[PDB]
Amino acid sequence: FKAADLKGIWQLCHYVSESPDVPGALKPSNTFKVLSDDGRIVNFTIIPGADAIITGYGTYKQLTDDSYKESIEKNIHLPMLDNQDNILEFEIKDNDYLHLKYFIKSDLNGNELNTWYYETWKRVEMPAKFPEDIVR
Amino acid sequence: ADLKGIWQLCHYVSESPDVPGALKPSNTFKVLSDDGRIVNFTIIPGADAIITGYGTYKQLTDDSYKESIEKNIHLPMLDNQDNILEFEIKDNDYLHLKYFIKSDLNGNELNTWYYETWKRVEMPAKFPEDIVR
Amino acid sequence: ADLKGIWQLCHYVSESPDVPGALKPSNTFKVLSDDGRIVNFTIIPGADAIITGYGTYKQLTDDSYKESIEKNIHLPMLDNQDNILEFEIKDNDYLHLKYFIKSDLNGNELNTWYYETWKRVEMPAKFPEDIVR
Amino acid sequence: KTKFKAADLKGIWQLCHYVSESPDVPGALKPSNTFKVLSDDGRIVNFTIIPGADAIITGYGTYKQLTDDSYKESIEKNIHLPMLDNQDNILEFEIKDNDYLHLKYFIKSDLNGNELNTWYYETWKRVEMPAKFPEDIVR
């Protein structure tokens, strides 16, 4: 296969809605995934007005056209992935949205979970101009 | 009925557009004062919060109250009108409301029921550590 | 002075200790009602907002008002006390306050001035597009 | 002679700014909205989170440590400081207590040719993994 455009900085998004039945509108959130050029992965979450925190790190590698592996060293968000390979099924839609899914068999307590997790991330890009009235 | 207080609008948050969202507290507040005033306002992250509606209110029956709206920038068709809201407070903490809007701002037939869930804002026993005031 | 309203806590922020800063709105609100009630509350993103203090208030002079605090989880030393706040409203929108606490909860001498800056929450001309309520 | 024990530049750094409760009170150093990613493979990316909107990349390029107290950013594009586009910026630095990156750099002139001759100072804090994931946090 030819490498998908995974490398970059990705921003976690969620879907907000007025009813539980209507599909939500996409909104960018506080978590970032840095997929480096040398195969390193770092997840971190900003805490407004406080220190941001690293929540997971390791290495990554694309396996197929629609799957990549994160070889997680430590993950405080999902401790069951520590020293494990997590296979993420993915699709990049319109060059900017990374739609991923992964499966967790058992939780940190050892109980059967058998749950698929879904995430949407948006590629962080440089705009044409630096916006006025922004707090760096 | 225990309507007086500060209420926080809830919305539905999901990880995917296909998975049903979980009910979560959101950015909008309804202040139902002890002296019969109503104010709706919405916080805007990184900017000034905004008042979106105000007027007076009064409970009419066991399951209905009236908001006599002066101005409402969220729903301009309610300006200078009485809105009758059907309500139920479940478990002392959740205000479930429904109201009907006949027409939109242009006068076109809407005939839509709006449903809202608000959660009572309370004082907890202790001030939590590591929150940004 | 026009004390009545909803006030939003601000911080003064600069990129350097030498460059003059700017006021930036935060997560805390003070509701100074028309009937003399005061409520402080803080939004916690993704969780329930919390009431952190309440009581009554009354203007005393042109540049001072009193908060008769019943309970305050943020500042417990003000419980069942009158706090006299020196204030100035600059350009109708910014409430600059200062108050003095003589002693801590243990009765030890504190003799400390506390400063706060709040911005008046207003209704804008139009409801902005693409905000999350 | 312990230069191998020197603090790493590599990592994710968070820009600090000065915040107080009032303009009459001097601001305390606090973490802000801007991040510098100094990768293991010599890439630099500056980006700023914008509450309620998409975060934005504000500068990128490559970097390399030159001496014990200086490193170079070979900037491709920088929307925050456009005069650094396609230039090398030499940053004098010191890492204090492993966690604070104190840097300074000099800008001779702006894009318009206005002689500036100004030193810029920045403080960044190393972003780390805490022992436990905190409970009431928004991802």
Q: Key terms for this structure?
A:
homotetramer, eight-stranded antiparallel beta barrel, 59% strand, structural genomics, unknown function, lipocalin family, unknown function, tetrameric
How do the helices and strands line up, and which of them pair or pack?
The structure is a homotetramer.
Chain A: E1 8-17, E2 25-35, E3 40-45, E4 53-64, E5 67-75, E6 84-93, E7 97-106, E8 112-123
Antiparallel strand pairs in A: 1-2, 1-8, 2-3, 3-4, 4-5, 5-6, 6-7, 7-8
PDB class: structural genomics, unknown function
Keywords: An eight-stranded beta barrel, lipocalin family, Structural Genomics, Joint Center for Structural Genomics, jcsg, Protein Structure Initiative, PSI-biology, unknown function
Assembly: tetrameric
